[PDB]
Amino acid sequence: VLSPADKTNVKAAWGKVGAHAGEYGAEALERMFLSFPTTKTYFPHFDLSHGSAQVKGHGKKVADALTNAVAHVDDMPNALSALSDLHAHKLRVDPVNFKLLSHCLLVTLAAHLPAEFTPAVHASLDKFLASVSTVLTSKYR
Amino acid sequence: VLSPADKTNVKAAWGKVGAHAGEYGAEALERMFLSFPTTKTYFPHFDLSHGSAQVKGHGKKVADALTNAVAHVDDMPNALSALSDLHAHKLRVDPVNFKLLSHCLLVTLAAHLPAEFTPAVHASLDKFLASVSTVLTSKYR
Amino acid sequence: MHLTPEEKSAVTALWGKVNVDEVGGEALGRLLVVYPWTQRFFESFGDLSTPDAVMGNPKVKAHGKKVLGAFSDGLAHLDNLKGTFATLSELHCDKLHVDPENFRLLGNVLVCVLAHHFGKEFTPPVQAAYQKVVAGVANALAHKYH
Amino acid sequence: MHLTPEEKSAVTALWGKVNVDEVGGEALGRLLVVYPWTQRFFESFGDLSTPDAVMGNPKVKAHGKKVLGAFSDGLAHLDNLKGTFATLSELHCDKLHVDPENFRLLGNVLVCVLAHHFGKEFTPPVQAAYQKVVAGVANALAHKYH
Ligand code: HEM
Ligand code: HEM
Ligand code: HEM
Ligand code: HEM
């Protein structure tokens, strides 16, 4: 459960991401593909080379979804309904992978927000990404 | 989310377990300790020898908790409140370990319910154990 | 893969009682029912709408038979799983794009199936030996991923 | 463990700039904050009630230094992580009763700390080389568990 302090931490940190959200989503994917190669099995149709516009485009979609989640932190299931449907019924990404992207998102944030990435903030972000992951996988079975 | 059919499946299988719940709980623990030796790290104070009273008593308490959950499948959070507090604040068992015990409980049930362990029931029990695990891990942070 | 002689024997002994085709179909069908996301690779198999539809699908059964036959052959090479599964590992990565997590899921479903099939003969020690094997096979199949 | 020339140099180069004392304390403190259940091993350490308490605890800083120092030693023996950590593996199992999953969590937190500390220098390829190492180390430490 996200405490009021967790929600404050998340909105503050994500606020600072601001317009760079898309760039950071792409970087997080890139980190994921290099660090955990098995994740590439879900994108056989993409050019995964560094700088790929496909990755960049996907990065922006992911980031935009995260922004929506932050905006609707008290109402995540409804805000992410279409995306939970999509992952559960079409993409069918094994649930394990969500933890890998989450870690990569955290690393990306750490590398870009030296001042904001406090231990307290780190904890709230981790909880937040786990909540998003839970929602996205909610309708798998 | 446990569907109505899932609840029916669970109540049917557990009903069959009946009076053997405690013995089954003990067997699941022994299966876990043997298959996943790292789980033994949480029981250094127990005599883990086969048929030990400590394991049989613990097996019993685990089974009773499970019975409670089946009885209150519509209100698990409330039914297991005390247990979720104990695990989060005192025991502090890493969440990974819940998946290992759940697997061993599934194996135990499969080995004892030839007639009832159908693909649909298997699916429902798996989901049920996942839900119990989620509730017990809910207050960790 | 290091198994004590005791463990190797527990494995070989039970396996001799297995109907490979039957267990193969059962295990693959149960994987598809219990973890439906795994159906993602099988849309060409037809009807997977219900448990009954899955369990009865001839394509599922035929694939199960193929998968378990390879598994079965691997049991003769417990000493060299990695070498034995190298080409298959490459194929699963490069051509089939199968997340290795699926191998772990199958391994766990296989253990449940053996337990259901053998009842009391599937003792805690026998399970432990099969757990090592199933993990060994999954690791061998994931080895060439990149 | 298996590292490509570029991966080894990536690791070695970054490590030359790490102040083990400082990073160690940060890594352990963050582990205790982010995954509080891990505090179960440090009941005698004092106040771990809030992030500020954890981070400023001298016993946490002390322990953190001890751990990363041992970690640093392994960086010197990348070819034989298992042989290197055998003794500590046994200790962590037999005397400390630490679930090896904790090694994995610490590995992830360390990566986070390095990224936090180095910023843009901690590039995707550098991270990837560190992920391999951290996993290698965790595996080496869990090796003697029984
Ligand atoms: C924070 C977690 C995640 C979020 C918020 C997220 C969000 C999204 C969004 C917004 C889309 C685009 C939907 C559309 O096209 O309308 C998408 C698609 C997709 N996602 Fe997820 N995703 C997450 C995790 C993952 C993970 C972990 C994987 C696999 C490693 C994955 C694999 C995919 C794939 C393969 C697509 C389709 C891409 C394409 O063909 O362009 N997602 N996701
Ligand atoms: C379905 C999942 C689980 C259930 C329902 C469950 C339930 C229980 C119950 C009912 C108790 C006894 C509480 C009391 O004495 O009042 C207990 C204690 C305990 N459990 Fe959990 N448990 C589960 C999973 C786990 C796992 C996976 C582990 C570790 C691998 C674990 C480790 C412990 C320990 C160490 C104790 C303390 C027992 C003692 O010292 O006697 N539990 N659990
Ligand atoms: C013990 C685990 C497994 C073994 C030993 C195994 C083995 C095999 C073999 C021998 C083949 C045929 C290769 C050929 O065409 O020469 C195959 C193909 C295939 N496997 Fe695996 N497999 C395993 C697990 C899985 C899992 C869990 C999945 C997905 C859930 C999967 C998906 C596929 C697919 C989609 C094909 C292609 C089938 C076709 O073209 O008809 N396999 N596998
Ligand atoms: C990076 C992996 C790790 C390494 C290399 C490592 C290394 C060490 C070393 C060198 C010692 C001191 C040995 C002695 O007393 O002679 C130690 C002790 C200890 N470690 Fe680990 N450690 C690691 C991870 C962990 C983790 C993740 C935990 C639990 C969260 C942990 C828990 C402990 C505890 C409780 C002690 C005993 C300290 C005391 O006596 O109060 N270690 N470790």
mmCIF file of C-alpha atoms in Angstrom, chain C:
data_model
loop_
_atom_site.group_PDB
_atom_site.id
_atom_site.type_symbol
_atom_site.label_atom_id
_atom_site.label_comp_id
_atom_site.label_asym_id
_atom_site.label_seq_id
_atom_site.Cartn_x
_atom_site.Cartn_y
_atom_site.Cartn_z
ATOM 1 C CA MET C 1 24.755 -32.003 -13.264
ATOM 2 C CA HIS C 2 25.659 -33.410 -9.879
ATOM 3 C CA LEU C 3 23.246 -35.935 -8.463
ATOM 4 C CA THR C 4 24.245 -38.538 -5.847
ATOM 5 C CA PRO C 5 23.876 -42.062 -7.195
ATOM 6 C CA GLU C 6 20.832 -42.388 -4.951
ATOM 7 C CA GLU C 7 19.135 -39.443 -6.564
ATOM 8 C CA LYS C 8 20.020 -40.543 -10.092
ATOM 9 C CA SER C 9 18.467 -43.935 -9.324
ATOM 10 C CA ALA C 10 15.277 -42.484 -7.838
ATOM 11 C CA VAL C 11 14.905 -40.572 -11.099
ATOM 12 C CA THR C 12 15.605 -43.446 -13.513
ATOM 13 C CA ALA C 13 13.456 -45.925 -11.584
ATOM 14 C CA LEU C 14 10.264 -43.799 -11.634
ATOM 15 C CA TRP C 15 10.842 -42.698 -15.235
ATOM 16 C CA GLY C 16 10.716 -46.329 -16.379
ATOM 17 C CA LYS C 17 7.061 -46.334 -15.301
ATOM 18 C CA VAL C 18 6.149 -43.238 -17.286
ATOM 19 C CA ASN C 19 3.979 -43.189 -20.397
ATOM 20 C CA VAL C 20 5.963 -40.436 -22.119
ATOM 21 C CA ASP C 21 3.260 -39.556 -24.655
ATOM 22 C CA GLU C 22 0.550 -39.432 -22.000
ATOM 23 C CA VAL C 23 2.542 -37.438 -19.441
ATOM 24 C CA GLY C 24 3.750 -35.129 -22.207
ATOM 25 C CA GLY C 25 0.211 -34.202 -23.289
ATOM 26 C CA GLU C 26 -0.893 -33.805 -19.642
ATOM 27 C CA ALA C 27 2.015 -31.564 -18.659
ATOM 28 C CA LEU C 28 1.760 -29.313 -21.715
ATOM 29 C CA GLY C 29 -2.007 -29.045 -21.379
ATOM 30 C CA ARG C 30 -1.727 -28.200 -17.661
ATOM 31 C CA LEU C 31 0.912 -25.569 -18.375
ATOM 32 C CA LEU C 32 -1.509 -23.935 -20.833
ATOM 33 C CA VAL C 33 -4.390 -24.076 -18.356
ATOM 34 C CA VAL C 34 -2.594 -23.041 -15.172
ATOM 35 C CA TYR C 35 -0.441 -20.272 -16.761
ATOM 36 C CA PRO C 36 -2.506 -19.121 -19.737
ATOM 37 C CA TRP C 37 0.031 -16.570 -20.898
ATOM 38 C CA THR C 38 2.066 -19.523 -22.174
ATOM 39 C CA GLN C 39 -0.604 -20.004 -24.842
ATOM 40 C CA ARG C 40 1.011 -17.058 -26.652
ATOM 41 C CA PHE C 41 3.192 -19.471 -28.692
ATOM 42 C CA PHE C 42 0.357 -21.779 -29.705
ATOM 43 C CA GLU C 43 -2.267 -19.717 -31.525
ATOM 44 C CA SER C 44 -1.837 -22.002 -34.561
ATOM 45 C CA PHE C 45 -3.018 -24.981 -32.460
ATOM 46 C CA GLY C 46 -6.679 -23.974 -32.690
ATOM 47 C CA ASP C 47 -9.113 -24.091 -29.809
ATOM 48 C CA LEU C 48 -7.657 -23.386 -26.369
ATOM 49 C CA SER C 49 -10.829 -21.676 -25.096
ATOM 50 C CA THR C 50 -11.370 -23.946 -22.099
ATOM 51 C CA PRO C 51 -9.507 -26.481 -19.965
ATOM 52 C CA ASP C 52 -11.371 -29.266 -21.721
ATOM 53 C CA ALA C 53 -10.552 -27.741 -25.128
ATOM 54 C CA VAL C 54 -6.900 -27.487 -24.139
ATOM 55 C CA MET C 55 -6.576 -30.960 -22.644
ATOM 56 C CA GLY C 56 -8.251 -32.473 -25.716
ATOM 57 C CA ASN C 57 -6.433 -30.525 -28.430
ATOM 58 C CA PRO C 58 -4.532 -32.966 -30.630
ATOM 59 C CA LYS C 59 -1.874 -30.328 -31.445
ATOM 60 C CA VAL C 60 -1.209 -29.730 -27.769
ATOM 61 C CA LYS C 61 -0.871 -33.487 -27.199
ATOM 62 C CA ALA C 62 1.476 -33.852 -30.195
ATOM 63 C CA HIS C 63 3.648 -30.954 -29.020
ATOM 64 C CA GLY C 64 3.671 -32.371 -25.461
ATOM 65 C CA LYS C 65 4.868 -35.697 -26.846
ATOM 66 C CA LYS C 66 7.741 -33.962 -28.712
ATOM 67 C CA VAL C 67 8.783 -31.897 -25.698
ATOM 68 C CA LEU C 68 8.689 -34.797 -23.222
ATOM 69 C CA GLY C 69 10.486 -37.108 -25.697
ATOM 70 C CA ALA C 70 13.447 -34.686 -25.741
ATOM 71 C CA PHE C 71 13.256 -34.409 -21.947
ATOM 72 C CA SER C 72 13.239 -38.211 -21.689
ATOM 73 C CA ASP C 73 16.304 -38.513 -23.930
ATOM 74 C CA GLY C 74 18.045 -35.927 -21.721
ATOM 75 C CA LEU C 75 17.654 -38.247 -18.702
ATOM 76 C CA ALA C 76 20.238 -40.510 -20.333
ATOM 77 C CA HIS C 77 22.677 -37.571 -20.267
ATOM 78 C CA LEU C 78 22.291 -36.242 -16.718
ATOM 79 C CA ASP C 79 26.092 -35.859 -16.776
ATOM 80 C CA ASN C 80 26.045 -33.440 -19.743
ATOM 81 C CA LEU C 81 22.742 -31.561 -19.979
ATOM 82 C CA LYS C 82 24.348 -28.387 -21.289
ATOM 83 C CA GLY C 83 26.005 -30.212 -24.171
ATOM 84 C CA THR C 84 22.887 -32.254 -24.833
ATOM 85 C CA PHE C 85 20.566 -29.219 -25.013
ATOM 86 C CA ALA C 86 22.865 -26.699 -26.733
ATOM 87 C CA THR C 87 21.266 -26.680 -30.181
ATOM 88 C CA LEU C 88 17.785 -26.713 -28.713
ATOM 89 C CA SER C 89 18.760 -23.779 -26.469
ATOM 90 C CA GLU C 90 19.881 -21.805 -29.515
ATOM 91 C CA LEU C 91 16.714 -22.639 -31.442
ATOM 92 C CA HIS C 92 14.454 -21.596 -28.559
ATOM 93 C CA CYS C 93 16.271 -18.268 -28.283
ATOM 94 C CA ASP C 94 17.027 -17.353 -31.894
ATOM 95 C CA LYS C 95 14.029 -18.745 -33.710
ATOM 96 C CA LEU C 96 11.230 -19.428 -31.260
ATOM 97 C CA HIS C 97 11.785 -16.480 -28.902
ATOM 98 C CA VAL C 98 10.697 -18.481 -25.835
ATOM 99 C CA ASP C 99 11.319 -16.704 -22.480
ATOM 100 C CA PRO C 100 13.278 -19.291 -20.428
ATOM 101 C CA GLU C 101 10.882 -18.622 -17.543
ATOM 102 C CA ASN C 102 8.498 -20.970 -19.450
ATOM 103 C CA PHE C 103 10.965 -23.854 -18.942
ATOM 104 C CA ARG C 104 10.761 -23.332 -15.166
ATOM 105 C CA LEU C 105 6.953 -23.264 -15.218
ATOM 106 C CA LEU C 106 6.880 -26.475 -17.250
ATOM 107 C CA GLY C 107 9.331 -28.082 -14.806
ATOM 108 C CA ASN C 108 7.015 -27.248 -11.895
ATOM 109 C CA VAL C 109 3.925 -28.507 -13.750
ATOM 110 C CA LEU C 110 5.811 -31.684 -14.625
ATOM 111 C CA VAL C 111 6.532 -32.299 -10.930
ATOM 112 C CA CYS C 112 2.829 -31.813 -10.088
ATOM 113 C CA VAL C 113 1.873 -34.279 -12.854
ATOM 114 C CA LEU C 114 4.298 -36.920 -11.606
ATOM 115 C CA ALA C 115 2.925 -36.469 -8.088
ATOM 116 C CA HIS C 116 -0.656 -36.838 -9.372
ATOM 117 C CA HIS C 117 0.327 -39.879 -11.410
ATOM 118 C CA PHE C 118 2.382 -41.678 -8.756
ATOM 119 C CA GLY C 119 0.691 -40.675 -5.513
ATOM 120 C CA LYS C 120 2.559 -41.969 -2.485
ATOM 121 C CA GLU C 121 5.419 -43.338 -4.588
ATOM 122 C CA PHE C 122 6.395 -39.710 -5.328
ATOM 123 C CA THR C 123 8.061 -39.288 -1.911
ATOM 124 C CA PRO C 124 9.734 -36.107 -0.607
ATOM 125 C CA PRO C 125 13.208 -37.450 -1.554
ATOM 126 C CA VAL C 126 12.015 -38.489 -5.040
ATOM 127 C CA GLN C 127 10.527 -35.032 -5.544
ATOM 128 C CA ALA C 128 13.812 -33.427 -4.415
ATOM 129 C CA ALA C 129 15.744 -35.418 -7.019
ATOM 130 C CA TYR C 130 13.244 -34.458 -9.771
ATOM 131 C CA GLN C 131 13.417 -30.797 -8.684
ATOM 132 C CA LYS C 132 17.164 -30.812 -9.337
ATOM 133 C CA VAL C 133 16.650 -32.451 -12.750
ATOM 134 C CA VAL C 134 13.883 -30.042 -13.822
ATOM 135 C CA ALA C 135 16.025 -27.073 -12.726
ATOM 136 C CA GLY C 136 19.037 -28.618 -14.510
ATOM 137 C CA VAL C 137 17.094 -29.008 -17.768
ATOM 138 C CA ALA C 138 15.712 -25.443 -17.584
ATOM 139 C CA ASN C 139 19.218 -24.081 -17.003
ATOM 140 C CA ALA C 140 20.621 -26.128 -19.883
ATOM 141 C CA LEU C 141 17.902 -24.805 -22.234
ATOM 142 C CA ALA C 142 18.527 -21.199 -21.178
ATOM 143 C CA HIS C 143 22.315 -21.475 -21.414
ATOM 144 C CA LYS C 144 22.717 -20.223 -25.001
ATOM 145 C CA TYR C 145 20.336 -17.258 -24.677
ATOM 146 C CA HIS C 146 21.893 -13.920 -25.622
#
